[PDB]
Structure 1
């Protein structure tokens, strides 16, 4: 006797979507979540911050994402463009260089090497591919070196190296010395290439949902009602020939199938009986979360526009950030959003909380003008202290893992299927990846219930 046909573990976008798809087909589903809320790495509030709704977690929609805007449209949400006209900045240890709209500065001496370094990164990624990078002829050697070592071999310009460093520390939440070059190259390729992922007004960053991204999982949970269990951290998965028992301490739920819709690092904390096969076990233990904080400051007006700036900036150097204008037309304040990750977040963490705030305002004053001192609101979400997540924005892998265990990202283990963005064939790391992996896992389980 089963409590459900399928138990979905994790109420992020991936698990929420998988649960919705199965529920919509008349499958009996339970959606179990460790935290006191749904959303996972997505997390927003309409009312808690002055100036309008605010997203603490992921919030950008990409121009080639289709499951995410289609689901948002089905749930009654509306999008708005994130595209901000004006010059992006490229800042090198506080030395401001003004872009031409989203392009490198007019006759920057590093423009040509940046272009070549992006072509070479794309080419390395193409050699790996997204379907089976672990099976690629090139992968063993690339997976034995770090991104930092690849930069030392292939990049001469300090500017180009600093741009690559901010992008790895943010997009993977980890230092170029910590990430496998094979993992990085694969990651960027499977996100439609480097220009896709680093777009300030194109590629992965073009739109938002009015009212916050957390609405996606909240509206799904409303419809699932009593089949959602919060404060239900999964501690043990048992499997036998007829089903799966999922435990939260002594609390237990029995189903025919289970979908793990959480990162490999989440899986590593659970006890499996029988034990997982070896590649999946190594993958869970050795693919950690990156580290990222999201800092937001609100103001009366997007005063950066007085210098004709977009508010986007590659803030490069020892305390690197990716900065955006996060303002919506429906908001009553303007927002600057800054991301800081990996080794730059380690430095950020070494500062006192008051030093961090003062330092972030000094950056904004340097880049955007003195009106940056006239703050209305200052907030940080440090993803490293979020219980049952412990990092952001994504899973990364150190040397030797992708080539030896990557095939375990996607493969079911008996009656346990993997969703979560890390299992998506493309757009792993993104909400779109979360939905595609949820779709895949719901379809696989639905075929096994028929």
Structure 2
């Protein structure tokens, strides 16, 4: 006797979407979530902050994403463009260089090597591919070196190196000395290339949902009603010839199939009986979350526009950030958003909270002008302290893992299927990947139920 046909573990976008698809087909589903809320690495509030809704986790929609906007539309959400005209900034340890709209500064001495380094990175990625990077003839060597070592071998300009360092410390939440070059190159390729991932005008970042990205999971949970269990951290998964038992301490739920819709690192904390196969066990134990914090400051007006600036800034150096204008036309205040990750976040953490806020204000003054001092609201979200997530924005891998265990990112283990964005064939790391992986897992399980 079963409590459900399928138990879905994790109510982020991936698990919420898989549960929704199954429920929509009349499958009996339980969606169990460790935290006191749904959303996972997406998290927002319509009213807790002055000036309008605010997002604490992932919030941007890409121009080639389709599951995400279609889901949003189906749930009744409206999008607004996130694109910010004006001159983007490239800042090198406080020395500000002004782009031409989203392009490099006029006559920048580093533009040529930057373009060549991006082409080289894309070529490494293409040699690995998204379908099966672990099977590529080039992966063993690439997976035995770090991104930092690849930069040392292929980049000479300090500006280009610092741009690549901020890219990795942000988009993988980890230092170039920590991330396998094979993993990084695969990650960028399967996100449709480097221009896709760093473009402010076209690429993976062009729109937002009015009201916050957290709505997506909340609305799904609304419809699932009592089949959602919050405060239900899974501690053990047992399998047998006729189904799967999922435990939270002594609490238990029985089903025919289960879907793990959380990062490999989340699986590593669970006990499996029988034990998982070796590649999946190693993957869960050795693919950590990156580390990332998201600092937001609100103002009466987007005063950076007085200097003809977009508010986008690649703030490179010892305390590197990515900064953007996060303001929506329907907000009553303007918002600047700063992200800091990896080794830069390690440095940020070594400062006091007061020193951090003062340092960020000084960066905003340097980049955007003195009116940055007239703050209305300041907020920091440290993803490394969020229970049952423990980091951000994505999973990364150190040397040796992708080539020796990456095939376990997607393969089911008997009656346990894997969703979560890390399992997506493309757009792993992104909400779109969460949704694609949830769709795949739901389809596979539905086929086994028929």
Q: Deviations over 1:311-331 (max 9, x none)?
A: 000000000000000000000
Deviations 1:39-67 (A, max 9, x none): 00000000000000000000000000000
Q: Secondary structure at the match of 1:359?
A: helix
Deviation at 1:99, TM superposition (A): 0.1
Partner Cα separation in structure 1 for residue 382 and residue 201 of structure 2: 25
**Alignment-derived partner of residue 209 in structure 1:** 209
Match of 2:424 in 1: 424
1:37 is aligned to 37
Q: Deviations over 1:221-261 (max 9, x none)?
A: 00000000000000000000000000000000000000000
Aligned length: 450
Alpha-carbon distance, 1:70 to partner: 0.1
SS of equivalent residue, structure 2 residue 239: strand
Matches of 1:295 and 1:200, distance apart in 2: 19
- Residue 202 (structure 1) shift: 1.7
What are the superposed Cα offsets for residues 6-64 of structure 1, whole Å, 9 maximum, x if unpaired? 00000000000000000000000000000000000000000000000000000000000
Aligned to 2:103: 103
Which secondary structure does the structure 1 equivalent of 2:244 belong to?
A: strand
Looking at structure 2, the residues matched to 124 and 256 of structure 1 have their Cα atoms a distance apart, in angstroms, of 42
- Write the distance in 1 (CA, Å) between the matches of 2:269 and 2:199: 35
Q: After the TM superposition, which segments of 4 or more aligned residues of structure 1 sit over 4 Å from their partners? A: none
Cα offset, 1:104, TM superposition: 0.3
Write the deviation string for residues 101-138 of structure 1: whole angstroms up to 9, x where unpaired: 00000000000000000000000000000000000000
Q: C-alpha offsets along residues 271-316 of structure 1, whole Å, 9 cap, x if unaligned?
A: 0000000000000000000000000000000000000000000000
| CA deviation after TM superposition for structure 1 residue 161, in Å | 0.3
Distance 2:396 2:202 in 1: 24
Q: TM-score, normalised by structure 1?
A: 1.00
Cα deviation digits, residues 358-405 of structure 1 (max 9, x gap): 000000000000000000000000000000000000000000000000
- Residue 254 of structure 1 aligns to a residue in which SS? strand
Alpha-carbon shift at residue 199 of structure 1 (Å): 1.0
Name the SS of the counterpart of 1:262 in structure 2.
coil
The alignment partner of 2:49 has SS state of coil
In 1, distance between residues paired with 2:38 and 2:18? Answer: 14
Aligned partner of residue 144 in structure 1, secondary structure = coil
Quick one: distance in 1 between partners of 2:280 and 2:200? 35
Distance 1:389 1:203 in 2: 27
C-alpha distance in 2, partners of 1:367/1:135?
A: 45
Alpha-carbon separation, structure 1, partners of 2:118 and 2:446: 41
Task: Find the aligned partners of 2:75 and 2:55 in 1 and give their Cα distance.
Answer: 18
Q: Structure 1, residues 183-218: CA drift from partner, whole Å, max 9, x if none? A: 000000000000000012221110000000000000
Instruction: Give the Cα–Cα distance (whole angstroms) in 2 for the partners of residues 379 and 238 of structure 1.
Output: 41
**How many angstroms does 1:332 deviate by?**
0.1
Give the secondary-structure state (helix, strand or coil) at the position aligned to 1:191: coil
Q: Give the drift of 1:415.
A: 0.1
5+ residue gaps, structure 2: none
Secondary structure at the residue paired with 2:378? strand
TM-score by length of 2: 1.00
Q: Secondary structure at the match of 1:118?
A: helix
Q: In the alignment, what sits opposite 1:245?
A: 245
State the secondary structure of the residue aligned to 1:323. Answer: strand
- Provide the C-alpha distance between the structure 1 equivalents of 2:181 and 2:377, rounded to a whole number of angstroms: 39
Q: Quote the Cα distance in structure 2 between the aligned partners of 1:323 and 1:443.
A: 39
Q: Distance in 2 between matches of 1:377 and 1:202?
A: 30
CA distance in 2, matches of 1:166, 1:209: 27
1:286, 1:199 → 2: CA distance? 30
Find the aligned partners of 1:279 and 1:74 in 2 and give their Cα distance.
38
Deviations 1:402-426 (A, max 9, x none): 0000000000000000000000000
